UniProtKB/Swiss-Prot annotation:
Changing residue 195 to A/K/R: Strongly reduced affinity for substrate. Strongly reduced enzyme activity. Belongs to the AB hydrolase superfamily. It comes from Paenarthrobacter nitroguajacolicus. The active site is at residue 250. This is 1H-3-hydroxy-4-oxoquinaldine 2,4-dioxygenase. Changing residue 101 to Q: Reduces enzyme activity by about half. The lineage of its organism: Bacteria, Bacillati, Actinomycetota, Actinomycetes, Micrococcales.
Length: 274
């Protein structure tokens, strides 16, 4: 898998990124990570899509195999960083797919790149409603330099949802181990600011200048109340759809990769018929 790992200079910063350079018909699949983890979250999903698609996975600033402290930024910078990589690689049309709060990047990426470049988007397991007390409390903890690690552990609890999932545990306890408070504090502040200023992902997506097909595929929250906001938003908006995947954890890219692929392929094939 470290064949496709590349590094390049983006404005000030050196950013690492996956690229299989696969020469084939568009669109590119742009796999966007969330906060405080990297391309490794997508290693099983990359396997599913490798042969048939060109797959690109940009790591954010201070994210990668060797995490490093960097000056503050947010999702607007993540967008620019992603587009700069897309230019350097000479990629035109792409299908973005986000994990959790990489969705803020995805929904602003849709806005700036526009529907001819990015005609559709898949968001994975991303809390559609404005923060409930439990999650709100987590972000509070995350921002606190005294309790940030206690904060991440509270998330790992929720995310694993009482499951001894071998692969997702490896991601959280080994592949996210190196990420310190510079990331986690930053993610807390940006995410909280993202809800407050855009209201919610649903608000943000509905407020697009050019609305277009988006699908929300998720495995949690598992409650009937959460499906309902998803189906109510679906009723109300022709372009919105969703799929409940019934996988164990917060990371469908890892534990039900075959299923995540199936919805990406559907969208890719839909784009390929203009
Ligand atoms: Cl995230
Ligand atoms: Cl919640
Ligand atoms: Cl969070
Ligand atoms: Cl389309
Ligand atoms: K719909
Ligand atoms: Na567990």
């Amino acid at each position: 898998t470290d064949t496709y790992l590349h590094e390049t200079l983006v404005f000030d910063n050196k950013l690492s990124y996956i690229d299989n350079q696969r020469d084939t018909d568009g669109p590119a699949i742009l796999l966007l990570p969330g906060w405080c983890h990297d391309h490794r979250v997508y290693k099983y999903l990359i396997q599913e899509l490798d042969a048939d698609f060109r797959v690109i996975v940009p790591n954010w600033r201070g994210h990668g195999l060797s995490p490093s402290e960097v000056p503050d930024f947010g999702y607007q910078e993540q967008v620019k960083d992603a587009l700069e990589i897309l230019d350097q690689l000479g990629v035109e049309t792409f299908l973005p797919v986000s994990h959790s709060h990489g969705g803020w990047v995805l929904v602003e990426l849709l806005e700036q790149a526009g529907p001819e470049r990015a005609p559709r988007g898949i968001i994975m397991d991303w809390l559609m409603w404005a923060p409930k007390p439990d999650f709100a409390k987590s972000l509070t903890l995350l921002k606190d330099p005294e309790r940030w690690r206690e904060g991440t552990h509270g998330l790992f609890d929720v995310w694993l949802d009482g499951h001894d999932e071998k692969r997702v545990r490896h991601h959280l306890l080994e592949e996210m181990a190196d990420y310190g408070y510079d990331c986690w504090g930053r993610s807390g502040r940006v995410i909280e600011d993202a809800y407050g200023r855009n209201g919610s992902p649903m608000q943000m997506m509905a407020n697009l200048t050019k609305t277009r097909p988006i699908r929300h595929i998720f495995s949690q929250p598992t409650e009937p109340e959460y499906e309902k906001i998803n189906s109510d938003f679906a009723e109300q908006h022709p372009w919105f759809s969703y799929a409940k995947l019934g996988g164990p954890t917060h990371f469908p890219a890892i534990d039900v990769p075959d299923r995540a692929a199936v919805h990406i392929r559907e969208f890719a094939t839909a784009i390929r018929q203009g």
